[PDB]
Amino acid sequence: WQARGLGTARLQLVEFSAFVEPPDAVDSYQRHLFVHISQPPLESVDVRQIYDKFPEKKGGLRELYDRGPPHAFFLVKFWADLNWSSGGFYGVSSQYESLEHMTLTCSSKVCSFGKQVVEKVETERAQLEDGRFVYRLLRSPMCEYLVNFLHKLRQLPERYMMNSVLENFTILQVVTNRDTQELLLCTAYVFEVSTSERGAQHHIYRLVR
Amino acid sequence: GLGTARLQLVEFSAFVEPRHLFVHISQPLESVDVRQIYDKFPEKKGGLRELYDRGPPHAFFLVKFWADLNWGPSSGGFYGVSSQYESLEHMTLTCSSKVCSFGKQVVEKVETERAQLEDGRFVYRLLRSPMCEYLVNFLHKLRQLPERYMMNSVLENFTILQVVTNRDTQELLLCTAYVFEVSTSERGAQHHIYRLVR
Ligand SMILES: CCOC(=O)c1cn(CCCCN)nc1-c1ccc(Cl)c(Cl)c1
Ligand SMILES: CCCCCCCCCCCCCC(=O)O
Ligand SMILES: *C(=O)CCCCCCCCCCCCC
Numbered sequence: 001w002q003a004r005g006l007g008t009a010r011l012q013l014v015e016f017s018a019f020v021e022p023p024d025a026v027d028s029y030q031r032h033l034f035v036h037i038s039q040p041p042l043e044s045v046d047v048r049q050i051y052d053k054f055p056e057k058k059g060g061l062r063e064l065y066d067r068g069p070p071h072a073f074f075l076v077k078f079w080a081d082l083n084w085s086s087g088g089f090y091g092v093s094s095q096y097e098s099l100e101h102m103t104l105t106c107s108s109k110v111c112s113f114g115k116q117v118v119e120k121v122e123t124e125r126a127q128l129e130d131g132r133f134v135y136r137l138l139r140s141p142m143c144e145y146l147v148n149f150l151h152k153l154r155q156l157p158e159r160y161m162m163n164s165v166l167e168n169f170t171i172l173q174v175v176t177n178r179d180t181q182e183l184l185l186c187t188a189y190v191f192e193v194s195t196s197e198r199g200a201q202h203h204i205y206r207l208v209r
Numbered sequence: 210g211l212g213t214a215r216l217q218l219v220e221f222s223a224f225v226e227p228r229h230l231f232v233h234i235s236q237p238l239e240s241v242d243v244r245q246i247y248d249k250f251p252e253k254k255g256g257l258r259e260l261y262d263r264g265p266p267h268a269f270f271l272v273k274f275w276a277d278l279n280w281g282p283s284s285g286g287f288y289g290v291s292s293q294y295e296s297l298e299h300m301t302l303t304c305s306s307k308v309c310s311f312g313k314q315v316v317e318k319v320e321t322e323r324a325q326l327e328d329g330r331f332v333y334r335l336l337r338s339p340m341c342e343y344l345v346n347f348l349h350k351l352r353q354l355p356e357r358y359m360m361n362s363v364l365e366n367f368t369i370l371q372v373v374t375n376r377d378t379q380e381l382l383l384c385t386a387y388v389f390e391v392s393t394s395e396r397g398a399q400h401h402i403y404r405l406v407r
Contacts, residue, residue: 144253145313
């Protein structure tokens with residue numbers, strides 16, 4: 001049947017976050033969450049509606065959705081919290097869970113007007129824990145181009161301009177079994193800014209066709 | 210050639226199968242002022258300047274490739290990178306490949322490889338790693354160009370930086386900067402390995 005959270009039977013997202021720790025977190029620890037996911041069917045969105053927002057060739061949404069499997073595809077809409085003037089640590093943390101032991105390859109493609117501008121590919125081997133395997137990609141340093149982007153977005157004089165800019169900014173994550181090259185999870189991320197007093201939020205959708 | 214006492218490159222190839230080799234290394238060198246190539250890689254953290262500043266200086270090499278983009282009778286096919294290192298000490302390696310366009314990093318690929326004992330040494334085989342899609346698309350375009358001089362013009366802004374570290378100790382074992390031109394298929398692929406100095 002049909003997904004309740006961001007995951008399949010073979011690979012579930014446990015946690016995802018992007019954050020910054022101010023220079024003085026060493027003395028009084030804190031972190032600011034730009035976005036955060038911590039884990040009745042999910043609503044769906046037709047994948048044709050977003051093809052233009054990601055690349056369109058090899059490793060593009062259309063071609064990935066063709067390779068399948070269709071149930072592995074999700075869309076997350078984030079309301080990002082950009083209220084937090086620099087020199088801190090900017091990080092991304094990811095955690096997944098499976099019942100089988102695999103080695104994963106996680107690709108994150110940052111895209112501007114649907115054109116890939118950066119990419120990070122990491123591999124992570126399973127860790128056998130409580131009747132299940134865990135995959136930890138914790139505290140990856142954020143790419144500096146993304147840090148710069150955030151610094152710029154945050155200075156825009158109006159929220160509506162932040163949203164206009166973000167209209168053309170997306171992230172595609174594809175997780176595959178490094179050994180078989182099977183797709184395990186594909187997540188498209190689209191962004192708005194949250195309104196200051198509200199922190200980060202998200203809504204997860206299944207991508208259908 | 211491309212090596213220290215702790216770690217040597219044995220083979221490196223990038224290729225496509227339906228095997229065509231775009232580049233290939235199978236295993237004193239001239240020296241190049243690393244200063245000359247700072248502008249070919251980002252000045253950020255993981256910048257060639259900053260990596261070199263730490264050292265050790267004898268771990269840094271430059272490879273110039275004259276690539277062979279003459280394949281086909283052509284779309285699809287498997288695009289891969291195979292590398293092999295070797296050593297006398299037992300290690301686990303973190304292999305970072307950074308693809309750069311006009312000095313800015315556009316891809317970082319991180320892989321891990323554990324030593325395996327063979328013929329009385331340790332070998333590290335990162336074989337048939339799927340070439341990232343950025344590069345595959347890039348190569349598909351690059352090959353359409355009607356003249357080599359045009360391929361060369363495009364390639365003067367395209368570089369790769371590979372950093373290989375001892376995962377457990379975080380020590381730099383090898384750092385290689387790659388620059389690119391195209392060869393004629395008559396002449397075939399070629400490379401020239403240099404040492405980077407400062
Ligand atoms: C650093 C100065 O600005 C740029 O390089 C830049 C220019 N464009 C226009 C989009 C056309 C697609 N090539 N987008 C970006 C950009 C946006 C977000 C990120 Cl996170 C990054 Cl890395 C780059
Ligand atoms: C002119 C291009 C010839 C082929 C280039 C091969 C060298 C690329 C090294 C591979 C590093 C990144 C691989 C990937 O992540 O896709
Ligand atoms: C660079 O290292 C690639 C990192 C890929 C993960 C990026 C996740 C970014 C989180 C959203 C930032 C908020 C933008 C408004």
